[PDB]
Symmetry: C3
Subunit: 217 residues, 3 copies
């Protein structure tokens, strides 16, 4: 009953589910997990692990919360670090980042591979090559970095990157990207604490939509 069923969003597309939405796939350890499949963007078949859309969900959360995931299938959410690792351990998944502004401009960025280690390794980020994408690289800077929340500081910054830029991320010292920052709605005066992608709209603009998704590379 675990071997009958699907294991990625790509499988489901291959089996003729053409509509984006929440489907259940089976983890490599046979745990069933209800994921969001984007069956439309760039060929379709993407499993979506992060999604901001309207600012309705608090993303300024603690380690246990980022661990297990939070939010709503009906809106915004983080799939959870255990799940993101589970999905990306064994094998090779490409990463697509899709973004939108409040002026309705669509941007993206695409990476060759994407993997996060387990909690023992603080969900460490293993990033392949920037392939292309009109949003430009603002993730490579964050390669080989542990992931930090406000209540657990694993960055290379003598202070707390998560309290400062008000998010949660593979911070370094601190970031060129902050997709789990505060939903600030466009141009903001405050520094780099919005849904920010430095090479995109920069440190003072917070996107309307953001999605981070994976697909078997």
């Amino acid at each position: 009953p675990c071997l009958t069923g699907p294991r990625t969003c790509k499988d489901l597309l291959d089996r003729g589910h053409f509509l984006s939405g929440w489907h259940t796939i089976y983890l490599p350890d046979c745990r069933p997990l209800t994921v969001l499949c984007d069956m439309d963007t760039d060929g379709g078949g993407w499993t979506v692990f992060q999604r901001r859309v309207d600012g309705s969900v608090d993303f300024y959360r603690d380690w246990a919360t980022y661990k297990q995931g939070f939010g709503s299938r009906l809106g915004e959410f983080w799939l959870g670090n255990d799940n993101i690792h589970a999905l990306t351990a064994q094998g090779t998944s490409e990463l697509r980042t899709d973004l939108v502004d409040f002026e309705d401009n669509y941007q993206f960025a695409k990476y060759r591979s994407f993997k996060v280690a387990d909690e023992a390794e603080k969900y460490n980020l293993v990033l392949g090559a920037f392939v292309e994408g009109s949003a430009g690289d603002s993730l490579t800077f964050h390669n080989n970095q542990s992931f930090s929340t406000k209540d657990q500081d694993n960055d290379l910054n003598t202070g707390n990157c998560a309290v400062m830029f008000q998010g949660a991320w593979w911070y370094k010292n601190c970031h060129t990207s902050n997709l789990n920052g505060r939903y600030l709605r466009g141009t903001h005066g405050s520094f780099a604490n919005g849904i920010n992608w430095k090479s995109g709209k920069g440190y003072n603009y917070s996107y309307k939509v953001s999605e981070m998704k994976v697909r078997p590379a």
Copy 2:
């Protein structure tokens, strides 16, 4: 049934951490797709009422409140038969969540909450106010049949549901009216909005409202 999930609390305990529509099995093993709020106040809440944008007409008749109405994609009332079925084993709390148009949030938690069957006209059986920023505006409605425009069971020589375009355990008539008209903030009209008297009062209609239960 029986092994599977009985409540939204079960589903959380079993590792569904994301809010959303899941199917649970009632005290009678009838399968029921409900909305689980896996986030608020510990999570594990089954949500039976939701206003969010004003897209759904709530000024409806008895048969409609009976069976429920609305959309999983937005606003809805789970239906009185279902709400009764859900709280029959009268040991589950009520939380009322409310958001204004400046994103200021408020709430009100009650220690038990139960509605009788249609025979007893979905009478409201409410426990104690425990805590909450909304102030308490539900108690006043304890031990009262539920009325809709076409089924007048209030203590008011007229038709309360008509006079406040809603449906409720109306007395004479109300201090709370969460099924009233989606009036969008301050309104001139009297007490016919999504109103909670002790909250923002008789002339302010909230942006969001949710009524949810969980086993104590």
Copy 3:
């Protein structure tokens, strides 16, 4: 056996609109959107525009298999729409909203689309009623045209001029798969347009196309 249509589901006490799985006459599952509210309820919805978030200017293979998101806009796909209609008599119905929240509709006694061999050909009954007027009878007995597949009768490219897919003739009175232009637009007839409704220069806020047994 189980759920053949959204009407079945309503008859079984699913009163809330939303995505349910039903069983096509071949017995293939399909998760469809049920509108359990409008005009008695029990409608299976095969098209929906709501906010302009999804690109509808797509190619034949894409309209074939469907595209979009259960969370928003989408086209159920022509194979599914054919599967969905052909076997029985389903009764089309269109719901249009303009930006001043004015509501209009049209209803048709029957609605069917042929298979891909016949170019998903539109086979349409008579106008029952509709305050939107009738901007679709005009399109009866016409193959589907995508920007990349031209089967229209303007030897120019209808789909390209107006950017959308439809059973185009020479060219259109309705264009519900056109560009989400947000109300009044200067460009000609390339929005979400229904000619007898708010005409060739207004693009609705919402549009839905849904079917139900007669």
